[PDB]
Amino acid sequence: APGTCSIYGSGHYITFDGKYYDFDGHCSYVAVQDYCGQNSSLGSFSIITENVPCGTTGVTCSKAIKIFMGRTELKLEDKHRVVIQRDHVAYTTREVGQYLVVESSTGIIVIWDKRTTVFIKLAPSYKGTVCGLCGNFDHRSNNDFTTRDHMVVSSELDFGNSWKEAPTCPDVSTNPEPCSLNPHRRSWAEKQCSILKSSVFSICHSKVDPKPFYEACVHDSCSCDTGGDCECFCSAVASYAQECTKEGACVFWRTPDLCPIFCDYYNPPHECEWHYEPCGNRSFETCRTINGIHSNISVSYLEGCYPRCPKDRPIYEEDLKKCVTADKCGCYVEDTHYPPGASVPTEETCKSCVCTNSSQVVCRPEEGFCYW
Ligand SMILES: *[C@@H]1O[C@H](CO)[C@@H](O)[C@H](O)[C@H]1NC(C)=O
Ligand SMILES: [Ca+2]
């Protein structure tokens, strides 16, 4: 029973609690934090999305995600996870299918597709104790629009604006209407996006209502008018797929003509490792699934290109893109991978260290005084 916030395409949001709503601000904003009480200082983590305008109609798209876990700051930007400041909470950074996943010992998962979409998973412990654009995760939709000042509002725009992180950003006064703005895109938009209501997604229509996702798929196909509309369309179908695969109803919607994916590209010369899985596979073992964070909270189900490793080397080792035996993974220290044999660094005195040929990190003193 975790909660999931979604932020995708050109300004669409799904609170932990099931409220769909659009908001298009050109600022950084608080997707969710637990600094939500009366005290400035009382809380743990904030997750920020930096949004930018995308297209000419005035909509805005998510471009980066900032993660604060206590005094630690991470950014997801330019297809990377980069570290801005660190002193220590534990997090691990895996690539999973299409996505890039940051996972923390404290119940927090960020799932990012390296473009406009992010999912945020919180462990059930956080119920009630969060706030921001994702709501407060208390099973009640009616009340997610709580301003940073603890007032309830009906206005999408007041809500969103009160969760801006830099006060010099201007406020939003209007919610753009891209299809009326760009009627010459209405037809293509409604045709492509009509897959979401078609037979292909039949099984999911019991579990997830496709109206909001269809409407945002059209929104975006009209608003992506500067280049690259097929990525806005495909992103928008994929967000729906996800909710399905979550709520049980994995759909194989991709085809060579519609939103093709090129997993075969990653295959070496005479091999057939890499393959598209539309629902992941739950028993996917990587070197980082085994030696990093192990939360109750599942990410296996994401679509992407996955490798198939042999019996003789069942464990995919992300960092060197090779298959290996569990004991030849290497070492992880502060989410940094050292291979067997490599030397592991040490802000400690007279103490040298090594990652062994068995994926353990062990240290040795140096008597050059200092001893055992
Ligand atoms: C909470 O606010 C009080 C003042 O209301 C302040 O003394 C305190 O340092 C703040 N943070 C805490 C107690 O962690
Ligand atoms: Ca709520």
Author numbering: 856 to 942, 946 to 1226, 1237 to 1240
Task: Give verbatim excerpts from the published study on this entry.
Mucin glycoproteins are the main structural component of mucus and thus play a central role in protecting exposed epithelia from pathogens and mechanical damage. The mucin protomer contains amino- and carboxy-terminal oligomerizing regions separated by a central serine- and threonine-rich segment heavily modified by O-linked glycans. In the first step of quaternary structure assembly, mucins dimerize by covalent association of their carboxy-terminal regions. The second major event in mucin multimerization occurs by covalent association of the amino-terminal regions.
To explore the mechanism of disulfide-linked multimerization of the MUC2 amino-terminal region, we determined the crystal structure of a recombinant MUC2 fragment containing the VWD3 domain and investigated the oligomerization state of the entire amino-terminal segment spanning almost 1400 amino acids. MUC2D3 containing high-mannose sugars was purified and treated with endoH to leave only a monosaccharide at glycosylated asparagines. Diffraction data were collected to 2.7 Å resolution. However, the MUC2D3 protomers in the crystal asymmetric unit were found to form two disulfide-linked dimers rather than a trimer, consistent with the sodium dodecyl sulfate polyacrylamide gel electrophoresis (SDS-PAGE) and SEC-MALS analyses of the MUC2 fragments. The structure of the MUC2D3 protomer shares the constituent folds and overall organization of the homologous regions of VWF, with the exception that E-3 is not packed as tightly against the VWD3 β-sandwich as in VWF. Cys1130, located in the TIL-3 domain, was suggested to be involved in MUC2 oligomerization, and its participation was confirmed by the MUC2D3 structure, in which Cys1130 bonds with its symmetry-mate across the dimer interface. Although a second cysteine is not necessary for dimerization, Cys1088, located at the amino terminus of a helix in the C8–3 domain, was found to form an additional intersubunit disulfide. These two disulfides are about 27 Å apart from one another in the interface. In addition to the areas around the two intermolecular disulfides, a third point of contact between the subunits in the dimer is observed midway between the disulfides, where a proline side chain (P1114) inserts into a hydrophobic pocket lined on three sides by aromatic side chains (F1120, Y1123, Y1124) and on the fourth by an intrasubunit disulfide (C1121–C1163). The small and predominantly polar multimerization interface observed in MUC2D3 may explain why it does not form readily in the early stages of protein assembly and why it may require a particular pH range, ion concentration, or other factors found further along the secretory pathway.
